[PDB]
Amino acid sequence: VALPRVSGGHDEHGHLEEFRTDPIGLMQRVRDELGDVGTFQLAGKQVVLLSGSHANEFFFRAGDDDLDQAKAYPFMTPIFGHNAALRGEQMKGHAATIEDQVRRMIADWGEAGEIDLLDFFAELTIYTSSACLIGKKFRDQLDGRFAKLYHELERGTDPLAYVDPYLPIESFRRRDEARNGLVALVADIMNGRIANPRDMLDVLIAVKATPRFSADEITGMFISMMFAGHHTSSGTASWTLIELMRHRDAYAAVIDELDELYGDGRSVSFHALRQIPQLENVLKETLRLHPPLIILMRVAKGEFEVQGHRIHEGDLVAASPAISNRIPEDFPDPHDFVPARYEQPRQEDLLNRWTWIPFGAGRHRCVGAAFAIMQIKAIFSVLLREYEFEMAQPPESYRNDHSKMVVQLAQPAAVRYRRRT
Ligand code: HEM
Ligand SMILES: CSCC[C@H](NC(=O)[C@H]1CC[C@@H](C)CC1)C(=O)Nc1ccncc1
């Protein structure tokens, strides 16, 4: 018995080509035509796309014995080749680290100027991530080259990886070359440390077996440590700023709140760990509209039924924060930016436990969420108190690029700044 299948997908790799150009439109059509359980074809693989509270509950409550997350991502192998840092006791230090990295990034801004949001936030979040997760010593040996290479690595996630992660296409060539470039950067750092003498890199260097670990092995470890939090935090920062500029009433409310809160004289390392309500509600609404992970994958390990539909062993099964986060029965006026949705009387995030899912839900809910929310609070506590921001292009022209499985803000994303006075 065939599962319901969405229209189209008559191209050579079925729906893959559409998934490479407009994955959100594809997923919305699955739901529009078929409901809570529908399928599309990615080359040789059927994807069973689940949506709505009932089907999402099944998806998110499944453990790795039923729905296996790791086997759904074999294409990350050419890229790769956290808990320690996410302990609550370390958060205060991380907030201070992040404040420091932001001030470093804006140190040359002067009175006024123009930035590109992807270039700015992508680079900044390389610095916050490396400093927090590997160490300040290591971060201080990084520069813009590392960020440029890391970005090429992220761009190595074209959905054609579902055909074969090793095809001779330019983005895969560039992925492999970028990884090579990172190993070289890391090798040069290790070499410098020999000649001129602690962090995680020192622990690893000291291991023996003759050194146990090569630059390639170490680079892989560091790439994997930084990956989950990099493009997600970068994009979320960009979109938080874009939504504030698009909604000047929300922006004004956030500024008033930051000024009042910081009037107690306590640092960002204090406040970024505590309530900043208007900014937090803007962040929640930003995540609902612009979830950086638009689809979540699993491989079925068994036979299941969901609303009469049978999932078979080996099936790819997916959930979509992009689609679920806009279900109109759950989120009134789902295309509208309404941070009031999260205020205490409404609490639409908390009420919709299985469909407000920018950070997932149940068994695999984001363990980086507290860090990521603190990081946004720390970044904007600095930026919005020091500078005022305006769009340098039409407000509707800021958009994501969905050509790779790793979503990124499309360029250009030009923004003006001017010192607040
Ligand atoms: C705004 C930033 C972030 C967003 C939007 C986000 C999103 C998500 C989502 C949707 C899931 C569920 C995945 C699934 O069910 O397949 C998840 C899980 C997870 N995230 Fe994040 N993430 C963010 C930042 C981070 C950071 C900074 C880290 C690490 C420092 C991280 C590490 C993880 C890990 C390890 C899981 C798996 C949890 C488990 O399997 O128990 N994420 N995240
Ligand atoms: C489909 S493009 C790759 C997306 C990427 N996924 C990954 O890095 C992981 C690979 C295998 C793991 C078991 C789980 C997911 C990622 O950035 N995931 C992520 C980010 C933030 N939190 C959780 C997962």
Residue numbers in the entry: 4 to 84, 101 to 216, 223 to 234, 238 to 449
The article reads:
A potential new target for Chagas' disease chemotherapy is sterol 14α-demethylase (CYP51), a cytochrome P450 heme thiolate-containing enzyme which is involved in biosynthesis of membrane sterols in all biological kingdoms from bacteria to animals. Azoles block CYP51 activity, resulting in decline of the normal complement of endogenous sterols and accumulation of various 14α-methyl sterols with cytostatic or cytoxic consequences. Based upon crystal structures of CYP51 of M. tuberculosis (CYP51Mt), three of the thirteen active site residues, Y76, F83, and H259 (numbering according to CYP51Mt), are invariant throughout the cyp51 gene family. To verify this assumption, we determined the binding modes of second generation compounds containing the N-[4-pyridyl]-formamide moiety by determining their co-crystal structures with CYP51Mt.
Compound 7 was not found in the CYP51Mt active site in the crystal, which is consistent with lack of spectrally detectable binding. Compounds 8 (3-{[(4-methylphenyl)sulfonyl]amino}propylpyridin-4-ylcarbamate), 9 (cis-4-methyl-N-[(1S)-3-(methylsulfanyl)-1-(pyridin-4-ylcarbamoyl)propyl]cyclohexanecarboxamide), and 11 (N-[(1S)-2-methyl-1-(pyridin-4-ylcarbamoyl)propyl]cyclohexanecarboxamide), were observed bound in the CYP51Mt active site as predicted, through the coordination of the heme iron via a lone pair of aromatic nitrogen electrons of the N-[4-pyridyl]-formamide moiety (highlighted in gray in Fig. 2) and interactions with the invariant residues Y76 and H259. Functional groups other than the N-[4-pyridyl]-formamide moiety in compounds 9 and 11 either were accommodated in the species-specific cavity or else protruded through the opening of the active site toward bulk solvent. H259 hydrogen-bonded to the carbonyl oxygen in both compounds, while interactions with Y76 were mediated by two similarly positioned water molecules. The residual Fo-Fc electron density map suggested two alternative conformations for compounds 11 and 9, designated by pink and cyan respectively in Figures 4A and 4B. The side chain of M433 also adopted two alternative conformations. In both complexes, a portion of the BC-region was disordered and missing from the electron density map. Although racemic mixtures were used for co-crystallization, only one enantiomer of each compound was found in the active site. Compound 9 bound both CYP51Tc and CYP51Tb with the same affinity.
